[PDB]
Amino acid sequence: CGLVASNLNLKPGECLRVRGEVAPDAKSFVLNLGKDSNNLCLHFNPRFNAHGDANTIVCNSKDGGAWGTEQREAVFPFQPGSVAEVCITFDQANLTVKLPDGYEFKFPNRLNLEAINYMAADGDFKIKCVAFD
Amino acid sequence: CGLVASNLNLKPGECLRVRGEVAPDAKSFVLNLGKDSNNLCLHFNPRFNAHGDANTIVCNSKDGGAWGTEQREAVFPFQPGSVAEVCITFDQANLTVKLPDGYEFKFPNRLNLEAINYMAADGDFKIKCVAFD
Numbered sequence: 001c002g003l004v005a006s007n008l009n010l011k012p013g014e015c016l017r018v019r020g021e022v023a024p025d026a027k028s029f030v031l032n033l034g035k036d037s038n039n040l041c042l043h044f045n046p047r048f049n050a051h052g053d054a055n056t057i058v059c060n061s062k063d064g065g066a067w068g069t070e071q072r073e074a075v076f077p078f079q080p081g082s083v084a085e086v087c088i089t090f091d092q093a094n095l096t097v098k099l100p101d102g103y104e105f106k107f108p109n110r111l112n113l114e115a116i117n118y119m120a121a122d123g124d125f126k127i128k129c130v131a132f133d
Numbered sequence: 134c135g136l137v138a139s140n141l142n143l144k145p146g147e148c149l150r151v152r153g154e155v156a157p158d159a160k161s162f163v164l165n166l167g168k169d170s171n172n173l174c175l176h177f178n179p180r181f182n183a184h185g186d187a188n189t190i191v192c193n194s195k196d197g198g199a200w201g202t203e204q205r206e207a208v209f210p211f212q213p214g215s216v217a218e219v220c221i222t223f224d225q226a227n228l229t230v231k232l233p234d235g236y237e238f239k240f241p242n243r244l245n246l247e248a249i250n251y252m253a254a255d256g257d258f259k260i261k262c263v264a265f266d
């Protein structure tokens with residue numbers, strides 16, 4: 001596992017900027033956001049070649065330990081062995097994810113979180129900077 | 134009640150930079166670094182008016198729950214209600230703390246830690262960025 005942070009107290013409208021290094025041999029990487037490891041408003045999982053996906057971003061929620069319905073994006077501005085950065089903001093209805101190519105997308109806030117208190121990176125994403133505004 | 138981070142994997146010679154907002158009414162604030170909450174290589178506790186001290190940085194270690202011998206610094210470049218940044222590095226002999234105004238001091242590495250994996254802020258220091266360099 002990578003860096004895990006708790007008591008983040010990220011509130012609607014605030015921008016979370018996360019930048020890190022993707023491992024050279026990575027098949028995917030993960031950044032998880034939510035209340036705790038069972039309760040994710042955003043599982044952000046760029047897949048290079050994993051679980052049947054090549055160069056696709058897969059996003060999901062997790063509620064009480066159960067995965068929701070995945071969403072897949074149309075762009076893939078990530079490479080193994082390079083710096084990856086994401087910017088995330090939310091309100092109680094949706095998260096908005098901004099990627100390093102400037103592409104923005106929405107993901108529904110299925111847990112109706114009023115605050116994001118938990119962030120976790122996997123072992124393929126080495127956090128170099130996190131800014132909570 | 135502030136940000137807690139784990140799996141930092143900060144190794145000797147690496148630098149950790151932490152920037153946060155000191156609460157307007159703070160009597161002190163705390164940044165703790167170590168293996169875990171009971172084993173701290175550095176309790177960094179700038180005190181405005183707390184525990185008998187006035188405008189003094191108190192540093193200590195904690196070993197299996199037990200506080201060590203306090204060290205007090207001679208300088209105090211902090212104010213309640215303002216942003217503060219500290220940078221920390223270590224080696225086998227000492228941690229080095231660099232303060233906002235450029236001042237540096239050493240604190241002994243009493244636990245003989247070879248990595249720092251845990252960090253926590255108290256509720257008077259609202260962390261805004263963390264960088265690893």
Ligand SMILES: CC(=O)N[C@@H]1[C@@H](O)[C@H](O[C@@H]2O[C@H](CO)[C@H](O)[C@H](O)[C@H]2O)[C@@H](CO)O[C@@H]1O
Pocket residue numbers: 043045051052058059060067070
């Ligand atoms: C096309 C499709 O539905 N594929 C899914 C896989 O994505 C899924 O893999 C898991 O997906 C979750 C997120 O939803 C995590 O990323 C987890 O690590 C993956 O293993 C598998 C297993 O649920 O089911 C389908 O194949």
Ligand SMILES: CC(=O)N[C@@H]1[C@@H](O)[C@H](O[C@@H]2O[C@H](CO)[C@H](O)[C@H](O)[C@H]2O)[C@@H](CO)O[C@@H]1O
Pocket residue numbers: 176178184185186191192193200203
């Ligand atoms: C002036 C003097 O000696 N004061 C000390 C306090 O520093 C001390 O408080 C604790 O100090 C530790 C770090 O060593 C933590 O900051 C802890 O939160 C404080 O309560 C108290 C208790 O040992 O003793 C004197 O008052």
